[PDB]
Design a protein around this ligand. Sequence first.
Ligand SMILES: CC(=O)N[C@@H]1[C@@H](O)[C@H](O[C@@H]2O[C@H](CO)[C@H](O)[C@H](O)[C@H]2O)[C@@H](CO)O[C@@H]1O
Ligand SMILES: CC(=O)N[C@@H]1[C@@H](O)[C@H](O[C@@H]2O[C@H](CO)[C@H](O)[C@H](O)[C@H]2O)[C@@H](CO)O[C@@H]1O
Lengths: 144, 286, 285
Amino acid sequence: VERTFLPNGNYNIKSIFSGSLYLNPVSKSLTFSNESSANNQKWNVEYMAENRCFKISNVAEPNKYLSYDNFGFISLDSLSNRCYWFPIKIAVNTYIMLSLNKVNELDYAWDIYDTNENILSQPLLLLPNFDIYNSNQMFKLEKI
Amino acid sequence: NSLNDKIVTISCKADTNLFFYQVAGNVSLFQQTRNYLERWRLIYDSNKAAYKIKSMDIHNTNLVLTWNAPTHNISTQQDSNADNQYWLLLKDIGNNSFIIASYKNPNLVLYADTVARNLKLSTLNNSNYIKFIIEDYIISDLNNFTCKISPILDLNKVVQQVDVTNLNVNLYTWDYGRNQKWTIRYNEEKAAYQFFNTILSNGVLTWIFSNGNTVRVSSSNDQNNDAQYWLINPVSDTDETYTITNLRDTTKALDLYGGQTANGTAIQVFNYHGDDNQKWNIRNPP
Amino acid sequence: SLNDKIVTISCKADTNLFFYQVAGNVSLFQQTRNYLERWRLIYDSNKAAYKIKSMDIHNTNLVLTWNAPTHNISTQQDSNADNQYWLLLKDIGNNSFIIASYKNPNLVLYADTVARNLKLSTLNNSNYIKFIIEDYIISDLNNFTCKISPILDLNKVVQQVDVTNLNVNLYTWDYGRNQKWTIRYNEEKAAYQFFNTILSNGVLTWIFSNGNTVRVSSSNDQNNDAQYWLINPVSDTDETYTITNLRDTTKALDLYGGQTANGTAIQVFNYHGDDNQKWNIRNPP
Ligand SMILES: CC(=O)N[C@@H]1[C@@H](O)[C@H](O[C@@H]2O[C@H](CO)[C@H](O)[C@H](O)[C@H]2O)[C@@H](CO)O[C@@H]1O
Ligand SMILES: CC(=O)N[C@@H]1[C@@H](O)[C@H](O[C@@H]2O[C@H](CO)[C@H](O)[C@H](O)[C@H]2O)[C@@H](CO)O[C@@H]1O
């Protein structure tokens, strides 16, 4: 049953810089790649009532979740407090994804670096968030 | 060590005409003022390997560049030696610019908002908006400054080239003529300055060491002449007073003959003793 | 300023580990004093960034490359790509460098000293992202304990006569401590001193107050710019140098006449490019 603004289920994850690039793991990094139509580009979103946050697992590796490491990178790892994500919906299915935890006593969010709106081969990082206007921190969650 | 205790100006690589400017706890970006409002002392902590950036404000004497965590805003606040008051000065070699990163959180660096004319913290990128020019305040104030030069014995008189064809240099009453104005340029390679008289394009103040102590304007297309270059040393407790020594022999100082203040009195070089006839006011032409 | 300089790069977190290249793989390894740990910095002025190219003699076209989006750093063929460019940020006062990716300047080199390789990190205050970048000659010679031979006879060496006689002459190699020199670099003076290992504070000095006399003196004459020397690599050699004094930089170090015999005195001489002013600096075997 629905508890929030974002229903449980399988999503593609995209950056607002490109409607044709899809979040998937490459080695131990997360990156946006050409549509593969495969499970590694499918993300299971699950609301957690106790913390009012979301955990997001990879469909091809259902016991691995989006998390972050000690080097500023988003990662795919087993469940832990680092796997809880606090979205801010800023448009139809555009979100800023904050870490539930304060990090270095700031809000930290997914962040993808662009060179003139090109994000090819960039790893998804976890960087400080100050507001809802940073394009590099805006992501689309598409139900699919 | 090399920057500790140094008083600097800080301008934007994105807009070199905009300088960090401080008043009453507010930091903004403003045109060059050549005064304490745009001067900052760098204070090194060896343990943190980081710097405080202290305003030389004359009324509030303990204000330092402060990141207002958790926002991205910058201000100047009373110095409490806090981590959010410390900065890593990272020199981008070859670019002659600095990225200035928060010591509290080095993910974040100063970013110049040239349209709002203020500073904020930002994550990194390859633009010039996060690159800054940090310069000794004397060099900053004097470099490309068009000025008139007066002995402190007579501030109504100025060092002048006699005219466009007479390259001699003498003391004379100030009459607003271009022959009485000099544009100072700093040479980074030589770590010294040239004085270009504004009545010519390539005429620089020069010690004619082939005629004893004589100084004259000569052409600057004579490039390996140290005698054309000068060190400009501020006299303490003054805003506009300098000693001026020659790059060839730094014991040789710009000298007003005899301390005589009559029109036509010779300007020359002479052994440095630091008396009043070797002290010069470099000033805005009114 | 740094363009085309050949350097070693070592870790501030472990100053005994250097960037090391073989066959496309980069690792952190002990000092080798050879081309496997040498890199040419190549500046692109428009990018304000550098390529970092291995001086490997077999493949001459390998540059430090970030294999985006992974955490892995390797050497790949130079294709002038953004993941082959690096911002060299000198941390002033700390005398070290942060090395940031041009492709994503939020990411900088991180020394994994336990795994002995490189990875990436966002900026922080740890020593693991700081690096010491040094001209390779300085890097090789600084704190190097050596023996010094004229190329005219690689069997004799420059020595202090003994612990009481501070004269300096040529003599046959016998592994004596008086026949070995510990080279120390003075960053402030941008020059070197040769410490004899039979003394504590005895350095090689030009006694200009006997004209051409070189000899060991104490370094208890704190400011004396004849206790200092410049060392210059003879072109296309491995171990061959010229040694010039800091006071007069045309006063090169000189083997008398070219006399390759025992007790031939050691002196300065006006630099004439010649073979009795050339020297081999080696590890004592
Ligand atoms: C008329 C006369 O010669 N008076 C001299 C002063 O000139 C002289 O002052 C010095 O003059 C030289 C000129 O080459 C330099 O300007 C120098 O800096 C001056 O000190 C003094 C010396 O003390 O003696 C007379 O008064
Ligand atoms: C006995 C004698 O003087 N023979 C000379 C050599 O000296 C000379 O070699 C030079 O000698 C000077 C003296 O200190 C320098 O060491 C210099 O570096 C040497 O080149 C040669 C020159 O070819 O000629 C004689 O043999």
